[PDB]
Amino acid sequence: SEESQAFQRQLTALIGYDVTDVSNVHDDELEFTRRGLVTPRMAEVASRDPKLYAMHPWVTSKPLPEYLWKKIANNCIFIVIHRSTTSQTIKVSPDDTPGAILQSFFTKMAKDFVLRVCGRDEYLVGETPIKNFQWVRHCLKNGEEIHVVLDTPPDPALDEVRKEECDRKFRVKIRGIDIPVLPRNTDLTVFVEANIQHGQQVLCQRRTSPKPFTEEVLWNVWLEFSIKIKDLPKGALLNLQIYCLLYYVNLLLIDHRFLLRRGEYVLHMWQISGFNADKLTSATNPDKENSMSISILLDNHPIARAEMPNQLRKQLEAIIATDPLNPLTAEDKELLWHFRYESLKHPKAYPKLFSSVKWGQQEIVAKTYQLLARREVWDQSALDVGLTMQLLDCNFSDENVRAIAVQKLESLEDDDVLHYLLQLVQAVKFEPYHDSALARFLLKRGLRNKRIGHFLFWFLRSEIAQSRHYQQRFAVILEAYLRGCGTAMLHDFTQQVQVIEMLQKVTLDIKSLISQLKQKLENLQNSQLPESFRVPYDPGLKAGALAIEKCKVMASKKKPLWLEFKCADPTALSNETIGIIFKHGDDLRQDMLILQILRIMESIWETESLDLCLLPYGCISTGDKIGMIEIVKDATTIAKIQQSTVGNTGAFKDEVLNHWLKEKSPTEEKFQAAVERFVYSCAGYCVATFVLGIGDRHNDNIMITETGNLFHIDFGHERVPFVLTPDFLFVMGTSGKKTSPHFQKFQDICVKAYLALRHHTNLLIILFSMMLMTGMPQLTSKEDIEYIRDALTVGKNEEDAKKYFLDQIEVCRDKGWTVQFNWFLHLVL
Ligand SMILES: Cc1cc(C)n2nc(N)cc2n1
C-alpha cells in the first residue's frame, strides 16, 4: 500500500535508521527477525487492558520504607483534590484505594472520573493502596503535598494500533584482505587469526602465515580446525582478526535457520580504536569505501542415583560460594560437571556450572540440555536479578541457558523492570541472534507499560544513533515496539524527536561560535518548534514554550546550552520552568549507566531502611557525544561556591560551604534540615562513588542544592578514594583531626550504607562488569572489572569491612585540600 509506505517513512524518522535498507547484509536474519517479532507484538497488544494501558499507573509492591512511615502522622495521608479555581483537602488511610478515596470525596461534598496528578500525565488509579503509588512516595519523601485534579480518563481509542499485514573437521579458506589506503602510523607485517568462539571462550584457533602489509594481501589458504562440523554449537562465531590487534569481524557459523554457513563471503571489518561488547557483533562495517575487508570461502545441513562423599561436597560448596570473578580451575570445572546433578540443586552455582560445559562437544551439550529439563529447583527458587544477569552476559552464548535466565525475569514487576531496563537493553549486545528471548521480553514489557515503553524507545534510540555495531539489531527491536505502542505514543515520540533534532542543531551551531543564541531560539519559536513535548527523561512532564529570557550558554569549555521551558499543563501548582541542559562533547551513555547504578544503590539502601539522598538526575544520550541533562533547581558547583569568595588560583577555604548554606536558608530550622541532608547525601556519594571507582573528582564536578543536597555530575570519562574535603567537614562541625555529633553520624551512615551494598556484592559485580563491557570501550575482562570486587572487600567480615571504610575516610582527612589543588597545579604547568 501507499499509506503503508508513508507509515514506514514515519517509523524511519522515529528510529533514525532505515530497517528496509539491505545494503549492509549477507543474509536475511534482520528481515526474518522483523517477521518473527510480529507474533510476540500482536500477542502483547491483544493482551493489554485498554484503560490501564492508557492511564499507566506507576506502582510498587514493595513495603513503605521505615523513613516514609515516620512521615505519616495518625495513619493519615492528606490529598488535595482540585476541580476548577477551588480545591478540597481530604484525610485518607495509607491502605485506601483511589476508588475508595473517590467515594470518600463525593460523600464529603454532596450539596466516570479519575484522579490525575496536578501538572502531570500521572494517574492515581487501579486496585492499589495509595501508599503504593510512586508519586505518593515521591511526595512523602520530599515533604510535598499530594495535589490531584478530578478529570476524565484518557480515551483508549487514542492508543489505536494500525492494522498489520557430519564427522569431517571444520575449515575456512582465507582468500585475502583488502584496504584502499595504507597510512596507519607504520609499515609492517600482517597475519589473520581465525577463532571458533562460544561464550567469549575460544573453542579452536588457526592462523595464517605473516605477510607484508600492503593494500591487498593474499593467502588462498585452507585453515583446518580440530573441531568436527558435528560439534559446532548453535551461537558459535567464526571470529576473524588481523594482527599487525588491528581489525576484527565475526560470522555466525550456524544461522538463524539452524543451517551451517556456506559459500563466499566478503566481510567489511571493524578497526580497533588506538574484552568489550562491540568485539562480539555479527554486524559488518557499513562503510564499504574505507574499511578493511576479508574474503573467505566456506565449503562444508540440519542440527544434531549416586551421592557425593563428604569432602568433595564441601569442596563443591566452597566453589559455589566464591564471587563471579573467581576463576575456575580445570579441577573446579570437572567437579562441577561430574557432580552436575548436585550443582543443579544450587541456583547460585548456575553461572559456574554452565561455564564448566564443553560447548564444543555435541554429546556434552546434549547432556546439558538433559540437565536443564529437570529444572524444578531453578523454577521454584526466588528471583535473584544478579544471578539472572550473570546468565545474560558475554560468558553465555547458548540459547537455552539464556532463556532460563529470561524466564526468571518474567516475574519482575514494572517498577523493577524500570530499575534494570537500561542494562537489560545493553545485554541485547551479548545475544548471538537478533531474535532472542531477551529482545522479546523487552518488547513485551514495553508494550505492556507506557513508562517502560517510553524509556525503551530512548535507550534503543541512543544506541541506534551512534553504535554502528548494534544499530541494525536495535532498529528492528525498536520498529517492533513502535508497531504496537499505539498512535498517541507515536505522535508523542514524533514531537520529542522533532524538538531534540532542532535543539541539537542550535547546540552545535552555538558551539562553532548570548545575543546569537537568543536570535536562533526566537527563529525556532517562530516556524519550527511544536507547541509542547514530553520531557524524555521525565515523560510525565510536558514542556511548552521556551522562556527565551532564561536561556543561556554555560561558561564552560564545552559551552552547553541552558534551556528553560514553560510547563504546558494549566493544572500545574507552580509557574516554575522546566530546565534542560543540551551538551556536546561528553559521552552521556556513560553518565546514563552510572546514574542507573545509583538508582539501584538507592533501592538496595531502601531494603535496609536507609535514605542516602542521592540525586540521580535525568540524562539521555541522543547521539555521538551529545544529549540532554535535567537541570536541578537552585543548585551550584562546590568550586563556584569557593570562587564566589574569590578563586585566587585554587586558594580553598574551609568555612565557605557552611556560610553559603546558612545564607541560603530562610530560617534556622531550614538550615538544620539542610545540614542533615548534607550529611546523608555526602555519605551516599562517598560510598557509591568509592564502590564505582569514580570518587576522585575535581570540585567543579560536585554540586549542592540550597537545601543541602550534595550530588556528583559529569560522569562521562596524589590519589583520594572519594571527596571529603575540609569544607565538607566544617559543615559537619569538624576540623583537622577532631570529631563531632554530625561527623559521627556521617561515619555511622557510611558504614551502614557500605555494609548494605556488600550484601548485594554479586549484583553490583555483574552490573559493573556489564557497564564496562557495553558502555566504556576496551576493558581488561579481568583487571578493570576486578576493581569493584576490591572496593567491596570480598572475603572480609563486617568488622574488617567497617574498619577498611573508616580508614578510607581518614585518607581523605589526611590529604585535606591537596588533591583538589593538584588540578590547578597541573592546569598551569
Ligand atoms: C550535569 C548537571 C546535572 C545537574 C543536575 N545540574 N543542575 C544544574 N543546575 C546544573 C547541572 N549539571
From Swiss-Prot:
It is linked to Immunodeficiency 97 with autoinflammation: An autosomal recessive disorder with variable features. Affected individuals have childhood-onset antibody defects, cytopenias, and T lymphocytic pneumonitis and colitis. Some patients may have features of hemophagocytic lymphohistiocytosis. It comes from Homo sapiens. The keyword Phosphoprotein applies. PANTHER family: PHOSPHATIDYLINOSITOL 4,5-BISPHOSPHATE 3-KINASE CATALYTIC SUBUNIT GAMMA ISOFORM, PHOSPHATIDYLINOSITOL KINASE. Residues 693-701 are annotated as: Catalytic loop. Gene3D superfamilies: 3.10.20.770, C2 domain, Phosphatidylinositol 3-/4-kinase, catalytic domain, Phosphatidylinositol 3-kinase Catalytic Subunit, Chain A, domain 4, Phosphatidylinositol 3-kinase, accessory domain (PIK). This is Phosphatidylinositol 4,5-bisphosphate 3-kinase catalytic subunit gamma isoform. Phosphoinositide-3-kinase (PI3K) that phosphorylates PtdIns(4,5)P2 (Phosphatidylinositol 4,5-bisphosphate) to generate phosphatidylinositol 3,4,5-trisphosphate (PIP3). PIP3 plays a key role by recruiting PH domain-containing proteins to the membrane, including AKT1 and PDPK1, activating signaling cascades involved in cell growth, survival, proliferation, motility and morphology. Links G-protein coupled receptor activation to PIP3 production. Involved in immune, inflammatory and allergic responses. Modulates leukocyte chemotaxis to inflammatory sites and in response to chemoattractant agents. Its EC number is 2.7.1.137, 2.7.1.153, 2.7.1.154, 2.7.11.1. Transmembrane segments: none annotated. The modification Phosphothreonine is found at residue 761.
